Paper text:
Bacterial enolase, a metalloenzyme involved in carbon metabolism, is essential to bacterial glycolysis and the generation of metabolites used in several bacterial cell processes. Prokaryotes express a single isoform of enolase which, in addition to acting as a key mediator of energy production, appears to be involved in the overall infection process - enhancing bacterial resistance, invasiveness, and tissue damage. Herein, we present novel crystal structures of E. coli enolase in complex with SF2312 and its oxidized derivative, KSF where the C5 hemiaminal is oxidized to an imide carbonyl unit.
Unlike in the E. coli enolase:SF2312 structure, Loop 2 (residues 154–165) and Loop 3 (residues 248–268) are disordered and Mg2 is absent from the active site of the enolase:KSF complex. The three monomers containing KSF all adopt the same conformation with an average RMSD of 0.29, however in chain E, the pyrrolidine is flipped ~135° compared to chains D and F where KSF adopts a similar orientation to SF2312. The phosphonate group of KSF is also within hydrogen bonding distance of Arg370, Ser371, Ser41, and Lys341. Importantly, the change in hybridization of C5 from sp3 tetrahedral geometry in SF2312 to sp2 trigonal planar geometry in KSF more accurately reflects the geometry of the PEP product rather than the anionic intermediate. The downstream effect of this observation manifests in a very significant reorientation of the phosphate group which no longer interacts with His158 and completely destabilizes Loops 2 and 3. This major conformational change is reflected in over 400-fold loss in activity between SF2312 and KSF (SF2312 IC50: 18.4 ± 2.84 nM, KSF IC50: 7.67 ± 0.38 µM).
Author numbering:
A (entry chain A): -7 to 430
B (entry chain B): -7 to 157, 160 to 430
The structure:
């Protein structure tokens, strides 16, 4: 006899704007407004170095503004054609909404409107619909994902020694990360993260090394070899009074694409030597004998599929192997990968494919093949904490959202603490068993 | 004949919790819940070096947790005594709420519950009332401040070369001010552009482009002076004119290098200066570069020195009390009376309530002093100082370099606000700064 406000979930207004990411560069923010007075706001993150096959991040190319990195073109697409195509449609139909933007854009890689325009509206629509449905975003995502009320708190891998391209050289491997698998809650995990992060500062100070931080809030000191990065991390874990292996395991992103030239992998650090896919695989293998490294990401170039097949036969039984640039959150590429025994895990970045629907497809493909899904940030982040809710709503089991420094990283850790506060053991922290090969 | 929910603004629940700041240290978050189903949520920031007279930040000191930096005690204060005293009180009465907590704590420096506990509730209370009143926070603050509908977009001073507490740079912060911009959106773009050109400049010279707490560069430079030289090189490379388009600001945090009544610059020969000598050094720099604002140019306890610096430089230069005043009307009042400084840096966690913070902005404006709404080194995703800066038409903000979302979420909030208000919230540029 009386209709609730919740039932008036038709899109009435969509606003795009240009905001600033954690590196000082424009990205796109979108608002979605429902008839019933429900609003959702979201932002696109930005990769520092993107995979070849990522959906297109549309930039202006206008030198007089933000050194060419403005996104007004992408925002215009939000405020006009996308807005006009979504007014009148039901926010609660995520897949319906994503399809209308995919079909209206019409290109394979979202090159007309920008993956950055379409994702911002996709995520903002999702938040609006959650509000209209009277639930928090993690709860709405679980329903959109076809796994209602099924939650976990993800085991984080925290990038605390930056390297390679987007640090300051000496170190070739892009990210060394700690995973607090020994924690019984994500709050405890986050504390253990903070402590080892602070103890590492003391260690680097002791050696006269720089304790300023890179894009992901980790340290970029000048180190003799890729190895020594692990060394200093081991010192910090002991100095915090945690036990390497039991309380904290290690993970890496090689971003091996960045140091691949003429079918060979070239390390500035460790001598200056060139390695074959096989030789590089054996180098990584050695590190996993000296240290408890249980996850290695982009261990080879995105286009070295023979390489990845070899690395997967050799290491894949003992070690989680994570596709990032390899799979770019794309079900077409992940499907080819599963079928060729390539990796056993995927890094989930919604802006590599550019819609939440196509993102949840990727997690489902992964989990149904017995691959793990790690919900991931980009080097270029915002105060947006969407990946926190996504990790919880999909029971992904793992998250990569940075060091324990910079609010571009820590907003996600804060959101995970808020969410665990609501859910308690309705979202268990499952620890080491989340990681592929444990 | 029907009562709207806006009118049911009695506090029914307050929740405290331990979240993490931009340095990885715990801080207090508070939620305030009104009967009419309105919520506000806010966090306390934390300073890296505090002034000696700041309202106490309550830490647990429990060495087995966050290296003794837990805030479970302050959170307990929020969930127990503060919640219990505030239940059933009207959130819309910001002054009444802040009064109940200051009285219940009963100490001078909020040393019972902690300034982090009282501030988080103070700010969450404000936001919840704003919701009850059906208005954005800047609009509510303008009404709490006795200045209805009176807005400006603040001229930002952006810390892009860090120093003092890891190089030969004694001066804590070198800042650019895009005074030549027509809007805060343009000002933010100009700061992005200069910040990115500076990176190229530091790479070309082989210096480190990793960032400190406030998202600025921390390279090892020869002298304090070269900090300014590289900033000029970046401004020229970004196609902007030093003086006209971009002015410069410093924070000496001179308290940090003050020992046996002398000012000792470890780098510049490790030489020792008297208040007067150090004032003349700062004077020299304002002849070589368009430095228009100097903060804590002397120790927080050298009131003699500040009286001299204010005589010499006050007419031409904005002189900003940070550790000198700690956003505290008792101290600022003694400062105004003795012709000490002409500008105050406003940190709501230095005094620990919104009401006391609004009092400090009013004391200053009435005295012809400028107010600069500031962050702390420890920040969160919280963007309150944006709304505070617009609501009080303060005219200036220090909320960081154009890097790290702990900073950029403030610029982002300013961009959102300016989109709504347009020319109702003018960017007045250089005329905001004391001595222009
Ligand atoms: Mg990667
Ligand atoms: Mg200061």
């Amino acid at each position: 006899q009386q209709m609730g406000r919740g039932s008036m979930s038709k899109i009435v207004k969509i606003i795009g704007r240009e905001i600033i990411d954690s590196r000082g560069n424009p990205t796109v923010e979108a608002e979605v407004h429902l008839e019933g007075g429900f609003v959702g706001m979201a932002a696109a993150p930005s990769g520092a170095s993107t995979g070849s096959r990522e959906a297109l991040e549309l930039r202006d190319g206008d030198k007089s503004r933000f050194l060419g990195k403005g996104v007004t073109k992408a925002v215009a697409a939000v405020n006009g054609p996308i807005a006009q195509a979504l007014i009148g449609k039901d926010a609660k139909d995520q897949a319906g909404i994503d399809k209308i933007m995919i079909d209206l854009d019409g290109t394979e890689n979202k090159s007309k409107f920008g993956a950055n325009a379409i994702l911002a509206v996709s995520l903002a629509n999702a938040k609006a619909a959650a509000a209209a449905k009277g639930m928090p975003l993690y709860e709405h995502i679980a329903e959109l994902n076809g796994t209602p009320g099924k939650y976990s708190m993800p085991v984080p891998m925290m990038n605390i020694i930056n390297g390679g391209e987007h640090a300051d050289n000496n170190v070739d491997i892009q990210e060394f990360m700690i995973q607090p698998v020994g924690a019984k809650t994500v709050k405890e995990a986050i504390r253990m993260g903070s402590e080892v992060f602070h103890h590492l500062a003391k260690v680097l100070k002791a050696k006269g090394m720089n304790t300023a931080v890179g894009d992901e809030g980790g340290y970029a000191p000048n180190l003799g070899s890729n190895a020594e990065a692990l060394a200093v991390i081991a010192e910090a874990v002991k100095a915090a009074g945690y036990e390497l292996g039991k309380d904290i395991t290690l993970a890496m992103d090689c971003a091996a694409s960045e140091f691949y030239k003429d079918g060979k992998y070239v390390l500035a650090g460790e001598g200056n030597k060139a390695f074959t896919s096989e030789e590089f695989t054996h180098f990584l293998e050695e590190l996993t004998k000296q240290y408890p490294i249980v996850s290695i990401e982009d261990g080879l170039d995105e286009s070295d599929w023979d390489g990845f097949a070899y690395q997967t036969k050799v290491l894949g039984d003992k070690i989680q192997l994570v596709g990032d640039d390899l799979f770019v959150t794309n079900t077409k590429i992940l499907k080819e990968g599963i079928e060729k025994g390539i990796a056993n895990s995927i890094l989930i970045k919604f802006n590599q494919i550019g819609s939440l629907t196509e993102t949840l497809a990727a997690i489902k493909m992964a989990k149904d093949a017995g691959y793990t899904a790690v919900i991931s940030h980009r080097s270029g982040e915002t105060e947006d904490a969407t990946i926190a809710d996504l990790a919880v709503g999909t029971a992904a089991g793992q998250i990569k959202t940075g060091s324990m420094s910079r609010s571009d990283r820590v907003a996600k850790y804060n959101q995970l603490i808020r969410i665990e506060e609501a859910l308690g053991e309705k979202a268990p922290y499952n620890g080491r068993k989340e990681i592929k090969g444990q």
